[PDB]
């Protein structure tokens, strides 16, 4: 309670259930780039929703950049469209949100050293290595990046509920350590 979490990224996958000729797809789309020495997939980008899709020869599709589960599924469908136009018997099976990344701002500073001691088991804090504290929650399996700024960043969520469920297990604790 108090404030509301804001989504910054959504990763998802689909199986176009088909063997793709990665090289052909590279030479037929100005918006695709392909570098085997760097990576064994094709990087294709569309403009709206501004996103990025990793395309594997197995027909597996990794999609990032989306700011909602809707955007994600949408841009995912558009990338399939391009494949179909490009000549492959693509389909759209097994769509799945793999990861969500949200952010918050409770507008006040936090005493990281205190939070870290009270929970030395679930979080690692070394300000001579990285700014802020990384806290690993176990129900739900969510990772929180907590900064003195008062800004929070949550990742590892598979469904939006986990964002709320998790950012409501930490607020009480972020209260004590003002």
């Amino acid at each position: 309670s108090g404030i509301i979490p804001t989504l910054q990224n959504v990763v998802a996958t689909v199986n176009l259930s088909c063997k793709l000729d990665l090289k052909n797809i590279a030479l037929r789309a100005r918006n695709a780039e392909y570098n085997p020495k760097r990576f064994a997939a094709v990087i294709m980008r569309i403009r709206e929703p501004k996103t990025t899709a990793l395309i594997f020869a197995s027909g597996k599709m990794v999609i990032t950049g989306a700011k909602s589960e809707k955007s994600s599924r949408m841009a995912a469908q558009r990338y399939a469209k391009i494949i179909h136009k490009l000549g492959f018997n693509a389909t759209f099976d097994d769509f799945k949100i793999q990861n969500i990344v949200s952010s918050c701002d409770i507008k006040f500073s936090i005493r990281l050293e205190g939070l870290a001691y009270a929970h030395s088991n679930y979080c690692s804090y070394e300000p001579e290595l990285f700014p802020g504290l990384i806290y690993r929650m176990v129900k739900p399996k969510i990772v929180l990046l907590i900064f003195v700024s008062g800004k929070i960043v949550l990742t590892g969520a598979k469904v939006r509920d986990d964002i709320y469920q998790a950012f409501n297990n930490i607020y009480p604790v972020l209260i004590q350590h003002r």
Binding site: L27, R28, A41, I43, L54, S58, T64
Partner: protein
């Protein structure tokens, strides 16, 4: 020498100033070997640039124009490139997962959604006659950008129409080959693009004139028959560029009608878009069923929806016996809300001449909940011209407009829907200052159609504000004598109005007791402007507590509406403005800027009010005109604003003088005085705000100032502001007296 000048133009990285560099160029003896360098460039900007240079060199330059009209089938295939650089060793499948993690931002978390399967493997120019040889080669290069560059160049050659240069004889043959063979697309936007084939087909449209009697077009419409959308595509884009030269229209249109149903959305788009340019007579009953079906598909987003709405709009405009079927009416409601702007605009243009209640209602919803203003203007225009809007529209929106300003609109009040105006979370994004703005706009629309009595109340703050003004508009129409409407006690309202009781009654009076002290509670401050608004509107046309309103109002739109009411009443000799004027004028000339909203709409009406003759006395005057001078500078009665221009001088008031500059007549007075004494300081801040045609008068006098050491720095400064404007067309408008100098001096400048 010149080779140095051309080699700095040669030098080039990163901007439009290089366009200005190409825009700069003119005439020289020879070389362009360096131009080709650009036409092979991989940049979308350089290829254009370079091709633009080629365009410059057109004179009595010879050109062979033998065209082999051959439809020879190829087996080639033209892509982005050869792809030989894809024959490389792939890193470990461990180093790769590492890369996917980074690209997809999966730090700190586990990712096990890829496997081994996923990573597997499937399967010299110097001579001129050699600079044209070189492009004929690139027309079929395996590098698409070289193909584009190549084609982009020819466009330039055949641009001008008027040495010895033979043009490739297999030119057309090469175009045709590209069109059927090139299979390179850009899928960046939902509307597909064929960079090469496009530029190609555009050339063909320039070649056609200087071309032997042919069967090219008949051949192109043959492409529409192919099973490969890419060749279809090629056909359509070429035909688009040649649509003028298309005879046997009925034969092309027949096919276009067919393709409206293509499984491919680009063929559907390009299809309709091209069909809008030809007569539609026989296929009439058919292209209607197709377009309507495409419209109803409810495919969340299809690029062709707009093109289909255009095709309907056309049929209905060109054949006025035909009218939209009542049943299909419910299929266009959604379009006013559609996420895509081209659809929203298109639908508001297709209903511009009809009068169905249902559509009337949807045009209103648009004015309330539309993102883009340009688009809201279309809907506003559609309603302001109406004297026959239904009462039930006036009533319904008269109390929709008065819902709580902190709760979303009801799904039950609208046929449209957005997660931006109907969710409790969406609102807090839009902000009330917009929500209110867009209500004030709908309000100005629905008042020209007869004003039934609104018995229905809602009892929110806003509800009172509007229903109050509503009665004022009513009274102004029936010249009802004024009755000092009664404002109850703060308590009263706190009992009735659902939006005020979102606040600590106590904390409230504290704010009321003394504003300027932003109360700590978050709901009070907002509810403060909601209050100051209601009372001012309730006591109108009493203006006692109007001064308060102007001082706190966040929403600029409402201050405008309110000033309209005031002025409308003033014109009708139905109100007294004197005390409000004074309290306004003061608050404005002292930094309360909401008051400008009034003086703009009241505008010139000021100069014929007692008060105006009384302003030529306040020591406050120039602080005032500083902020409003634009308003009055346009007046016809000039002698009046005249007394103030004399004052801006005496007081060296820059801002008030600049404003007086945009008008010619006042330069005449300014300059004719600057010559009597050169206040170079202000001249530096003043002159460049007038007509440059005068400058040539200040050159000699500004040199004495430097010749003898007088204001040396200043004079020299402005002097270098004026010199770059000596190449300026003198104005014929000005006094024939001042031409006796603008020309006398302007002459001695060329003397010798």
């Amino acid at each position: 020498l010149n080779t140095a000048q051309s080699k700095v133009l040669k030098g080039y990285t990163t901007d439009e100033l290089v366009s200005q560099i190409k825009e700069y160029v003119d005439f020289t003896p020879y070389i362009l070997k360096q131009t080709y360098r650009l036409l092979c460039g991989q940049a979308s900007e350089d290829r254009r640039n370079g091709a633009r240079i080629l365009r410059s060199l057109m004179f009595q330059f010879k050109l062979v124009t033998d065209f082999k009209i051959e439809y020879k089938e190829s087996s080639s295939i033209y892509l982005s490139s050869t792809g030989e650089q894809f024959n490389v060793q792939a890193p470990s499948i461990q180093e790769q997962k590492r890369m996917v993690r980074k690209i997809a931002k999966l730090e700190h978390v586990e990712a096990n959604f890829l496997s081994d399967i996923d990573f597997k493997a499937g399967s010299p120019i110097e001579n001129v006659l050699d600079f044209f040889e070189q492009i004929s080669d690139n027309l079929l290069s395996y590098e698409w950008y070289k193909r584009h560059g190549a084609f982009l160049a020819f466009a330039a050659m055949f641009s001008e129409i008027d040495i010895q240069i033979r043009v490739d004889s297999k030119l057309f043959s090469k175009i045709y080959e590209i069109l059927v063979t090139d299979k390179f697309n850009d899928f960046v936007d939902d509307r597909t693009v064929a960079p090469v084939r496009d530029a190609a087909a555009y050339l063909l449209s320039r070649i056609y004139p200087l071309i032997g009697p042919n069967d090219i077009i008949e051949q192109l419409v043959g492409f529409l028959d192919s099973g490969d959308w890419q060749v279809q595509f090629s056909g359509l884009i070429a035909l688009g560029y040649l649509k003028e030269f298309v005879e046997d229209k009925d034969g092309l249109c027949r096919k276009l009608v067919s393709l409206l149903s293509s499984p491919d959305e680009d063929i559907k788009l390009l299809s309709a878009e091209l069909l809008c340019h030809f007569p539609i007579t026989d296929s009439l009953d058919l292209v209607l069923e197709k377009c309507w079906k495409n419209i109803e598909s409810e495919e969340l987003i299809s690029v062709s929806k707009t093109s289909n709405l255009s095709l309907l709009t056309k049929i209905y405009r060109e054949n006025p016996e035909l009218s939209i079927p009542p049943e299909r009416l419910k299929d266009i409601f959604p379009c006013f809300t559609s996420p895509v702007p081209e659809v929203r605009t298109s639908i508001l243009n297709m209903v511009k001449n009809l009068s169905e209640e249902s559509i009337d209602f949807l045009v209103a919803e648009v004015v309330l909940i539309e993102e883009k203003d340009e688009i809201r203007e279309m809907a506003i225009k559609l309603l302001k011209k109406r004297r026959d809007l239904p009462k039930n529209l006036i009533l319904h929106f008269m109390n929709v407009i008065g819902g709580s300003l902190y709760e979303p609109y009801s799904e039950d009040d609208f046929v449209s829907y957005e997660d931006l105006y109907f969710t409790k979370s969406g609102i807090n994004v839009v902000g009330k200052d917009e929500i209110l703005k867009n209500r004030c706009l709908l309000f100005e629309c629905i008042m020209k159609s007869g004003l039934p009595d609104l018995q229905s109340t809602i009892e929110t703050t806003t509800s009172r504000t509007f229903i109050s003004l509503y009665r004022s508009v009513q009274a102004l129409v029936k010249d009802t004598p004024y009755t000092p409407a009664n404002i109850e006690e703060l308590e009263y309202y706190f009992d009735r109005c659902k939006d005020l009781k979102m606040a600590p009654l106590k904390e409230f009076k504290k704010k009321l007791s003394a504003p300027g002290i932003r109360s700590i509670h978050p709901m009070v401050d907002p509810l403060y402007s909601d209050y100051t608004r209601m009372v001012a509107s309730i006591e109108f046309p009493g203006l006692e507590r109007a001064t308060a309103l102007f001082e706190v109002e966040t929403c600029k739109q409402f201050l405008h509406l309110f000033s309209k009411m005031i002025t409308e009443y003033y014109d009708a000799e139905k109100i007294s403005i004197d005390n409000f004027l004074l309290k306004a004028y003061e608050g404005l000339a002292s930094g309360k800027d909401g008051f400008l909203s009034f003086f703009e709409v009241f505008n010139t009406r000021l100069l014929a009010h007692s008060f105006f003759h009384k302003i030529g006395s306040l020591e406050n005057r120039l602080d005032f005109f500083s902020k409003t001078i634009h308003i009055y500078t346009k007046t016809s009665q000039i002698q009046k604003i005249g007394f103030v221009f004399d004052d801006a001088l005496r007081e060296k008031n820059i801002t008030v003088i600049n404003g007086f500059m945009r008008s010619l007549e006042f330069n005449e007075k300014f300059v004719r005085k600057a010559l009597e004494d050169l206040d170079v300081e202000l001249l530096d801040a003043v002159l460049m705000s007038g007509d440059h045609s005068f400058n040539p008068l200040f050159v000699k006098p500004l040199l004495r100032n430097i010749s003898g050491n007088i204001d040396r720095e200043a004079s020299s400064k402005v002097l270098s502001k004026v010199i770059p404007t000596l190449g300026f067309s003198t104005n014929t408008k000005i006094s024939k007296d001042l031409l006796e100098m603008i020309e006398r001096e302007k002459k001695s400048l060329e003397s010798l």
